[PDB]
Write a structure and sequence with these properties.
It is classed as isomerase. By secondary structure, the chain is mainly α. It is 58% helix and 8% strand.
């Protein structure tokens, strides 16, 4: 598919762009609305909807537990969408989020100099809408699990069972079974690379970045 190839490839590159922006702005003090973008941008793209977007900007400094080796973030977006993820000391987020946290203001929002308009516009100015980042994430999650499968499972399941296992894992990971258009685009894409006799054998020795690149090289061609 022409369209989906274009987008996947577009985001793989756009992501490279948002990461430079990040490494620019995180050096920018704290109070900077742009330093606050770079921190939120880091939080977004590091997906490892609209509802929970609210809760994050509705994130109070008093729900951000901070300790020597971790930071536990807690929010509730429209009842059901309640979460409590953690950030480990080593992870890219810990320090900028440590610097962003103001403990002298428990009831004020972490991302106080940002909101709906601020974030949304940033990302879109990168050449991709929200949607583009979301489907990309599921494609990234599918490729990650697929990758993870080929190096952990010996002997290998074979193209159809490997693919089916990866979709199931991505549904378990992302929380829901992705669209049929999405599953179809990823299974096909994978069945077409599998036509190469050494594809799987090489993937079993790639790092995830070598692999993701091999996949962009293919989609781009």
């Amino acid at each position: 598919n022409a369209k989906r190839d274009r987008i996947f490839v577009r985001v793989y590159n756009v992501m490279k762009r948002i990461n430079c922006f990040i490494n620019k702005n995180i050096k920018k003090s704290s109070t900077d609305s742009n330093y606050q973008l770079a921190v939120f941008m880091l939080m977004e793209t590091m997906f490892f909807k609209e509802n929970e977007t609210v809760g994050l900007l509705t994130l109070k400094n008093k729900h951000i537990e901070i300790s020597p080796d971790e930071i536990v973030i807690k929010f509730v977006g429209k009842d059901k969408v309640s979460h409590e993820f953690v950030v480990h000391k080593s992870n890219r987020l810990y320090k900028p989020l440590l610097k962003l946290t103001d403990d002298s203001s428990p009831e004020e929002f972490l991302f106080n100099k940002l909101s709906e308009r601020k974030v949304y516009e940033c990302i879109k100015q990168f050449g991709i809408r929200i949607k583009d980042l979301r489907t990309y994430g599921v494609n990234y999650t599918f490729l990650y699990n697929f990758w993870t499968n080929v190096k952990s499972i010996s002997p290998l399941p074979s193209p159809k069972k490997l693919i089916a296992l990866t979709i199931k894992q991505t549904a378990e990971v992302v929380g829901h079974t992705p669209s049929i258009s999405k599953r179809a685009y990823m299974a096909t894409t994978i069945l077409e690379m599998v036509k190469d006799k050494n594809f799987l054998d090489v993937v079993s020795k790639t790092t995830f970045d070598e692999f993701l690149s091999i996949v962009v090289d293919h989609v781009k061609s």
